[PDB]
Amino acid sequence: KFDDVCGCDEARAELEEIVDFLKDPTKYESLGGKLPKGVLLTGPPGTGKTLLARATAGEAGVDFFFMSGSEFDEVYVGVGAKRIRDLFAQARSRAPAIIFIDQLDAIGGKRNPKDQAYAKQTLNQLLVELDGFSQTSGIIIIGATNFPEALDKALTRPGRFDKVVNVDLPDVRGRADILKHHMKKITLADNVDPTIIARGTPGLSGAELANLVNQAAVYACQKNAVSVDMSHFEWAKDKILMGAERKTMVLTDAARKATAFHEAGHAIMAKYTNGATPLYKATILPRGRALGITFQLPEMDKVDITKRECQARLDVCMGGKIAEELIYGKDNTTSGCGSDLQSATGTARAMVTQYGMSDDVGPVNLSEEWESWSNKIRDIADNEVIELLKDSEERARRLLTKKNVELHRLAQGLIEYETLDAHEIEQVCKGEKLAKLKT
Amino acid sequence: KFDDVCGCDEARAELEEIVDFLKDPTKYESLGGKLPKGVLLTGPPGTGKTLLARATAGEAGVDFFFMSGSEFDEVYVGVGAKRIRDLFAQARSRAPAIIFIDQLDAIGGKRNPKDQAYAKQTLNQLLVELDGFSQTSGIIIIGATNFPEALDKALTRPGRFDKVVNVDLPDVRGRADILKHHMKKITLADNVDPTIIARGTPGLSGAELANLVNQAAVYACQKNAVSVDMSHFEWAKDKILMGAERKTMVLTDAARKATAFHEAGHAIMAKYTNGATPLYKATILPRGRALGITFQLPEMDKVDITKRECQARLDVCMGGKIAEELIYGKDNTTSGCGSDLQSATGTARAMVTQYGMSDDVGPVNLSEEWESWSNKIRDIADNEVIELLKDSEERARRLLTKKNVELHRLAQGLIEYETLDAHEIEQVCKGEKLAKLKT
Ligand SMILES: Nc1ncnc2c1ncn2[C@@H]1O[C@H](COP(=O)(O)OP(=O)(O)O)[C@@H](O)[C@H]1O
Ligand SMILES: [Zn+2]
């Protein structure tokens, strides 16, 4: 039923109206209303699509005729047409039913005539027998593929598959309810907040959330612990998101204090800056890819970005370079800070070449045809991007020149404890002992 | 049947002439006439061109052979031409047949001589099939294209495509006929004036009218209504014009307020400016693919806007950003105003280059061949595009400083009601009650 699927409500709604056709056809038939023969399920791969068709067919009283397309590439065909007419003939025997077809690209496709001959024979067997039934009091074919490009053109004609619905990647409460639905099978520990890790994986599927819960339950289960707390879930989250953990790295103390001032710079002026996304777990662990990460947890839309949040994240992307300038002098800035620079540059161009956030260019969209404009407007636009980043590093220079005490406290706090929460960062910046085993 | 194509009386008269030629040759072949070897239908998408072809074919008793131009994959070298040789090869075995080629402008384009080997093998095979060495008898080719000016000189030669029937977009007395025809298929309508919906929807085509009617019938089915009344036609009409409504997930007083100020800006600019098209509705709901939308709609159908209308468009597309800066200050202008600047950019740039509405540039067309022109002229042109947009936002600011009370009124009532047609806005702007229910 519609309880088993989690998230994806904008597809579930049109599925309950088409199922409102499905359990009572004669009402929609008596007035002259018509609805398409078969609907098309698209979207990213593996977002709970077969569970939408099984959920519709399961909550209604109907039969669910499942068949895959890729299984027609297992053998030479000509017989696949015969099992298709077996399938639709059996569907006309059991008149309240729906017919789900998985990976429709393998039935269709645009191929060489040596195999487009009989592949076209099974294909237009499907095309003929999509026409060999009256729509009245009949059956609705549901077809699903994640590649709308690979589908055959003649199969997508009016008189055939018409209404196209999208099954996309879920939002924050969608991932919260998917994560809860997979939490309903393992042994949890305490107040395990699903919404603190629901946001935290921005734009990822549902099956990978099953990998998150599954690998986290494995990792708790080999430690011979009691249950699965928050540490296991954020452990497997920080494995699937970035990468594994290097327990074999032997590194000096100058490097540890250098990256300590880098992460302390990002953490401080990510913390004290007007408008930023609030602070979260900062570390200096080499988590696979990077060496020291600051985490940040927002919960709004990106449409609610503004000029204050854009200048806020431009000030977040200068704390490392300005921290390493103000501590170690000028001629000792490293190169990894330059990686942070590219994120800054991206945001800066969106403040000039898409929005109206620059009073010297004018209100325009310079982004969709950049090559069309001449050189003078690109000089004014690129110049405004340059003074935007210079003003960002000037504000970062002063707000880290007047917060030096928290920079050293949070710095050697990251040297001694090497993992801090925002509550714990607040305890470090006040000069307070924080009741935790050091490392 | 020719009755099924309601609207397009004169073009249908033209094809009726050909069917009359087929049904008794001797009346027309008595002075030396012959069948036109080719007829080319022109007109925008979905105006009923294949409908006419199936009218002649299915009405005159000859085999109809469909083939689409946007179906030729062009992944390999040989197929495409092989499809044409097979298609014509099978059509000659059914001598009085008809061959319909849809979207010629996808395969038959300009034969640029500097195309290496394989771009124009299909077009050459087509040319040799239409008017080649061995003659064809009793075959009629009907080619439906949207851009007659894009086809090449060789394919539109008198001898391959004899006539050029123009099926243009329907007018009000035509739309009344289409609506009458498709409403006729419904068995039940209580009291509905087709000229109401016909005068209400300028610019729509035959297909959008057909699914207007069908969506109204289905919508009457869902609500378990007894009939098909005018409110249903209004729901389906607003659906097709403004976009499919989406169930309101969530909102806050802040987001809802800011949005109400945005569409309040577009709506006030739409009303009080001069030259703008009339106003239809303002909405605070998430309709279609946008957060609220103020839809304008002309009373009469115009072929081309003058300078005052387009300057009116430039002034209307600044109400969002200017309203949000008057209310929420400069530093809070969101990034949802990107589409406004995209559209306004398009309008101004088509004003300067194509339409020839600027004096320091001159009476010259710079749109096509944009690469060839030098950098001097591009500098002047882009200078006047940007100057024109800056001036537009100047006017929108200076007007929305004069309409604070109307702005806050319409925004507040728009919060309270979530939807408003132009009359209700006219009442709300003067502080009057609307006689309906809050929220
Ligand atoms: N003159 C007309 N009379 C009746 N229906 C029309 C007319 N023109 C377009 N339509 C409608 O448009 C829809 C699409 O028809 P089609 O022939 O596929 O469009 P096109 O030939 O422009 O691609 C049909 O449902 C048809 O009812
Ligand atoms: Zn807008």
Which domain CATH number covers B36?
3.40.50.300
In the listed set A170, A185, A200, which residue is the last one of a domain according to the structure? Answer: A170
Which of B186, B220, B333 is closest, CB to CB, to A357?
B333
In the listed set A125, A153, A170, which residue is the last one of a domain according to the structure? Answer: A170
The residue behind tokens 């001449």 is A374
My answer on whether A13 and A150 are in the same domain is: yes
My answer on whether A272 and A384 are in the same domain is: yes
Domain that holds residue A228: 171-243
**How many Cβ atoms are within 10 Å of B385's Cβ, its own excluded?**
24
What is the distance in A from the centroid of ligand 2 to the CA of B429?
20
Structure token digits, residue A411? 């710095």
Ligand 1 pocket, mutate which of B3, B51, B177 (most atoms under 8 A from CB): B51
The residue behind tokens 């609220």 is B292
My answer on whether B225 and B251 are in the same domain is: no
Q: What is the resolution of this structure in A?
A: 3.4
My answer on whether B133 and B261 are in the same domain is: no
First-last CA distance in chain A: 50
- Which of the ligands is closest to the CA of residue B261? 2
In the listed set A221, A243, A265, which residue is the last one of a domain according to the structure? Answer: A243
Domain count, chain A: 3
Whether ligand 1 lies within 6 angstroms of the CB of B5 is answered as yes
What are the CA-CA distances from residue B205 to residues A36, A117, A379, B83, B229 (Å)?
A: 20, 38, 45, 32, 22
Which strands sit side by side in the sheet containing A140-144, from one edge to the other? A63-68, A97-102, A140-144, A38-42, A164-166
Which of A303, A356, A368 is closest, CB to CB, to B333?
A356
Q: Using a CB–CB cutoff of 8 Å, tell me whether A165 touches chain B.
A: no
Residue type, A256: R
Dihedral over Cα of A312, A314, A315, A319: its sign: positive
My answer on whether A133 and A107 are in the same domain is: yes
Q: Write the DSSP assignment of B307-368 as a string of letters.
A: HHHHHHHHHHTTHHHHHHHHHH-GGG--STTHHHHHHHHHHHHHHHTTS---TTT-S---ST
Structure token digits, residue A296? 């940040």
Q: Consult the annotation and say whether B429 binds a ligand.
A: no
Give B 10-29 residues with CB within 8 A of chain A: none
CB pairs under 8 A, 24+ apart, for A410-413?
Answer: A410/A264, A410/A267, A410/A268, A411/A257, A411/A260, A411/A261, A411/A264, A412/A257, A412/A260
My answer on whether A263 and A384 are in the same domain is: yes
Question: Are A277 and B310 spatial neighbours (Cβ–Cβ below 8 Å)?
Answer: no
Phi, psi of B227 (to 5 degrees): -150, -160
User: Do B247 and A350 make contact, defined as CB atoms within 8 angstroms?
Assistant: no
Q: Consult the annotation and say whether B266 binds a ligand.
A: yes
My answer on whether A177 and A166 are in the same domain is: no
Residue type, A340: D
Query: B286 CA to chain A: closest CA distance, Å?
Result: 12
For helices A307-316 and A253-271, angle between their N-to-C axes, nearest 10 degrees: 170
Choose among B403, B390, B418, B391: nearest CA to B270. B403
Verify whether residue B324 is a known catalytic residue: no
The residue behind tokens 């507040």 is B412
User: Do A364 and B218 make contact, defined as CB atoms within 8 angstroms?
Assistant: no
Phi/psi class of residue B248: alpha, beta or left (left: φ > 0; alpha: ψ in -120 to 50)?
Answer: beta
My answer on whether B200 and B307 are in the same domain is: no
My answer on whether B67 and B120 are in the same domain is: yes
User: Do A374 and B375 make contact, defined as CB atoms within 8 angstroms?
Assistant: yes
Whether ligand 1 lies within 6 angstroms of the CB of B178 is answered as yes
User: Do B318 and A363 make contact, defined as CB atoms within 8 angstroms?
Assistant: yes
| Radius of gyration, alpha carbons of chain A | 29
My answer on whether A186 and A146 are in the same domain is: no
Atom 16, ligand 1: residue with shortest CA distance? B48
d(CA A30, CA B221): 9
The domain that holds A204 is classified in CATH as: 1.10.8.60
Give B 75-134 residues with CB within 8 A of chain A: 75-76, 79, 82
Whether ligand 1 lies within 6 angstroms of the CB of B174 is answered as no
Q: Consult the annotation and say whether B212 binds a ligand.
A: no
Structure token digits, residue B187? 């068995």
My answer on whether A147 and A208 are in the same domain is: no
Give A 344-383 residues with CB within 8 A of chain B: 350, 354-357, 361-365, 368, 372-377
DSSP letter assigned to residue A293: -
My answer on whether A256 and A377 are in the same domain is: yes
- What residues are paired with B99 via a beta bridge? B65, B141
DSSP letter assigned to residue A149: S
Q: Is A53 helix (H, G, I), strand (E, B) or coil?
A: helix
First-last CA distance in chain B: 49
| Residues placed in the known binding site of A for ADP | 6, 46-51
Expt. technique: cryo-EM
